[PDB]
């Protein structure tokens, strides 16, 4: 994997109308993957995890990793992560969650659910003042229901 | 003085739509992460994050399941993103050099 750098000219012509994003590191990133459960084994989840860790590193993030956590461990550790002092001096934040899920929630390795509303709240303007006015990216690799999409014919 | 809503300046990319399943391959991993890494690595230099997530949506819309003899053969997935962003989000990778 390689990330093409932006040009000095691109930066000069775009930085005034974008979020400030020049800190080094650009932000902290968390990649939390649950692969072993009770909820079948998530074959290929190891490839996903490795890919994101590599990507976020190449995008200039300091990457934190967690694997196979219970719902309670996820909540506690996401909160620890949101409360880290580094957020005051970085310009953005990334959180990637990869597991089984249902609409609005994701599973811990114990088959218990963590609500995504609870996750986002940890990073909000009230609970995470260090990230106020800074862009916060979330990527959620999880099912949101058990309905398989059969697809439809194009008319 | 200017105050803030309780929640703002977030973007959330989801692998699938409400009510549905996201797809994953044993060898290549999840369709959505595979696409996300391909687009972000190629386009972070000149495209903002919401616009890259649109390119991801294009890739996912086009893919189909390969699983002969099960309910997943030729199945589909659609990704989405939700945004309370208030500006363009450029990652400006590798600047300054």
């Amino acid at each position: 994997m390689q990330v093409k750098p932006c040009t000095p000219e691109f930066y000069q012509t775009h930085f005034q109308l974008a979020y400030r994003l020049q800190s080094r590191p650009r932000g902290l990133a968390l990649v939390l993957s649950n692969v072993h459960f009770t909820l079948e084994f998530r074959s290929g989840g190891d490839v996903d995890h490795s890919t994101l860790v590599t990507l976020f590193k190449l995008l200039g993030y300091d990457v934190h990793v967690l694997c196979d956590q219970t719902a309670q461990e996820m909540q506690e550790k996401l909160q620890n992560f949101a409360q880290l002092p580094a957020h005051r001096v970085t310009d953005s934040c990334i959180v990637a969650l990869l597991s089984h899920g249902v609409e609005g929630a994701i599973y811990g390795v114990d088959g218990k659910l963590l609500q995504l509303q609870e996750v986002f709240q940890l990073f909000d303007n009230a609970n995470c003042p260090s990230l106020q006015n800074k862009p916060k990216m979330f990527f959620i690799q999880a099912c949101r229901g058990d309905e398989t999409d059969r697809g439809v014919d194009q008319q | 003085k200017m105050r803030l809503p309780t929640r703002s300046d977030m973007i959330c990319g989801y692998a699938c739509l409400k009510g549905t399943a996201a797809m994953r391959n044993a060898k290549r991993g999840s369709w959505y992460i595979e696409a996300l890494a391909q687009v972000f690595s190629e386009r972070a230099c000149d495209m903002h994050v919401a616009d890259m997530l649109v390119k991801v949506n294009a890739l996912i819309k086009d893919r189909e399941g390969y699983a002969p003899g099960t309910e997943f053969h030729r199945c589909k997935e659609m990704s989405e993103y939700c945004s309370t962003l208030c500006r363009h989000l450029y990652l400006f990778p590798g600047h300054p050099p």
């Binding site: 079948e40 998530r42 074959s43 089984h100 899920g101 690799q141 999880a142 099912c143 058990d146 398989t148 | 692998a15 699938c16 399943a21 996201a22 797809m23 994953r24 391959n25 044993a26 999840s30 369709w31 399941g65 390969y66 699983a67 099960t70 997943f72 199945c75």
Partner: peptide
């Protein structure tokens, strides 16, 4: 083969 997350 492709499977459900």
């Amino acid at each position: 083969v492709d499977v459900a997350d």
